[PDB]
Amino acid sequence: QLLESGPDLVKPSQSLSLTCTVTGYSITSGYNWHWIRQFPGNKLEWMGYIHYRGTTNYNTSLKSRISITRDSSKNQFFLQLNSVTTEDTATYYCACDDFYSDYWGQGTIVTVSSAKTTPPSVYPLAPGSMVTLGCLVKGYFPEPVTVTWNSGSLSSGVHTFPAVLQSDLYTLSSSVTVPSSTWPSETVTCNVAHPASSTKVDKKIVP
């Protein structure tokens, strides 16, 4: 139904832009199409929407910096938030709804910072009846980063922890538990992706 897209890192004082490509319904037929964001801390804020007709409605406190427009032909609408500040760092979601029904996108994170993109360094964590394996992803910026095990075949038994900020760099860790008789017999590898720097690393966990 709805997918959000746009650059991840945007400098303070500049403008933030996002695209929502809708599929399975004409955004000119019906529904109200909104832009809603969630700040780190989970606080939510409705930003605005545009009717089936280019008529718009914005959150008063954003009225001077926001603009919502669309391109019928491509079945997508956009969001521009001018003069961003770090306070605009958030997960942006696009959505639609009528009195009875709503649809949302997966949401896309945008970081407003003067800091510069830094790839992460992936380190393996092997043991000092199941065995617990790890993977340390540290020194990167901005968020997000994705971590999978064996390309996803090892999804269950995985605990990927929230990243923690420190010295203007995020650090994260991930764990996976498997039967003692599976590792190191069968290869266990953590896959890490960091789109902001187009990084894709693979670290085999060696005993």
């Binding site: 606080k43 949302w104 929230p162």
Partner: protein, 211 residues
């Protein structure tokens, strides 16, 4: 500038137990919507017009209220109902949201599985040395990790992180990472990760020897 106060911020409920969450408005509001958001996904409207249900929302859920007091009730909870619930109003501009109420699911106490990991080769080859410790699948969430190098609590310089309540077994997991410099690391020998939870009188210890 219409403040929505939700209470409590966090609350736990056993399966089958009735559950009620409150939303207090700073000024009267005519309507109120509720949204549900589970870990890793996006909000989803749960209730509109203060009391109506959108297709897909279990009948066990119901909303009610008026003026400055609204509430979301779960007649009987199921573990699938664990999430954060936000109330919102469209009466004034802008359409404010409450800070949300996190509904935890209660369950028997479960001891944490502890695992400790020495710095890797790749890392030690960059002068770095991060010691990591995992405390997986425990309950209650409140727990405390303690680092010790050569028998002395290496207190500061530790980064901890918690996962949300597991959707499968309803437990919690946490990670503790003490970062040192390659040189300070090779200057000590005993590295212990000590965890004190509700599941044991004595702390659960785990520790390697740098050799």
């Amino acid at each position: 500038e219409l403040v929505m106060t939700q209470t409590p911020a966090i609350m736990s409920a056993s399966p089958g137990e009735k559950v009620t969450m409150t939303c207090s408005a700073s000024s009267s509001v005519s309507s109120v919507h509720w949204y549900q958001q589970k870990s890793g996904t996006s909000p989803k409207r749960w209730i509109y017009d203060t009391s109506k249900l959108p297709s897909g929302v279990p009948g066990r859920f119901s909303g009610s209220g008026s003026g400055t007091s609204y509430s979301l009730t779960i007649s009987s909870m199921e573990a699938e109902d664990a999430a954060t619930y936000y109330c919102q109003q469209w009466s004034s501009n802008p359409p404010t949201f409450g800070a949300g109420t996190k509904l935890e699911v209660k369950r028997a106490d479960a001891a944490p599985t502890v695992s400790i990991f020495p710095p890797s080769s790749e890392q030690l080859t960059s002068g770095g040395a991060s010691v990591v410790c995992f405390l997986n699948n425990f309950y209650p969430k409140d727990i405390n990790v303690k680092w010790k190098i050569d028998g002395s609590e290496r207190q500061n310089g530790v980064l901890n992180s918690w996962t949300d309540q597991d959707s499968k077994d309803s437990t919690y997991s946490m990670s503790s990472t003490l970062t040192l410099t390659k040189d300070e690391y090779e200057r000590h020998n005993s590295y212990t990760c000590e965890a004190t939870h509700k599941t044991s009188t004595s702390p659960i210890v785990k520790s390697f020897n740098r050799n």
